[PDB]
């Protein structure tokens, strides 16, 4: 019914130096079919030892239901070139209107930490499962504030 932003063929070339190519580029596909707001791109991304690699994120918006409104929640899910054996690594990507609300699950860097993430396991996890706790979560206690 939706428009197409990017195909399978098009996902496989951009994860080329991925370990479990077939398998990411499915699950990507299943979550950008599904989350027409989420767009996967390829950046640089910047470990704590300091080293950079290339990876495939999704970014963009989810949807959250909130006391009465529906939010669109920026995020940002990078895949590891070992996905679907590691998790994603999460943040929520304010914009400059916004504030990031720190808690039990979101630190002052916007990164998310969730039991779905620390029990990953493949098959079992996946990222269509993880959006879901996300929204759950995010449902309960948003992670970004934009008013008193």
């Known amino acids: 019914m939706a428009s197409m932003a990017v195909s399978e063929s098009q996902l496989k070339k ?12 499915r699950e990507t596909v299943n979550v950008i079919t599904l989350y027409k707001d989420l767009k996967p791109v390829l950046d640089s991304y ?3 030892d300091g080293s950079s690699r290339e990876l495939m994120n999704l970014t963009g918006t989810i949807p959250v ?19 679907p054996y590691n998790p994603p690594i999460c943040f929520v990507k304010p914009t400059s209107s916004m504030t990031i609300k720190t808690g039990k ?8 930490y969730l039991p779905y993430l620390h029990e990953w396991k493949h098959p079992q996890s996946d990222l269509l499962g993880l959006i879901q706790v996300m929204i759950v979560v995010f449902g309960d206690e948003p992670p970004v504030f934009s008013r008193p």
Do not use: E
């Open 14 to 25: 951009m994860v080329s130096k991925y370990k479990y190519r077939d398998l990411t580029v």
């Open 46 to 48: 910047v470990f704590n």
């Open 65 to 83: 239901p909130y006391r009465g409104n529906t939010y669109n929640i920026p995020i940002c899910l990078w895949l590891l070139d070992t996905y």
């Open 105 to 112: 699950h979101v630190d002052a860097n916007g990164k998310i």
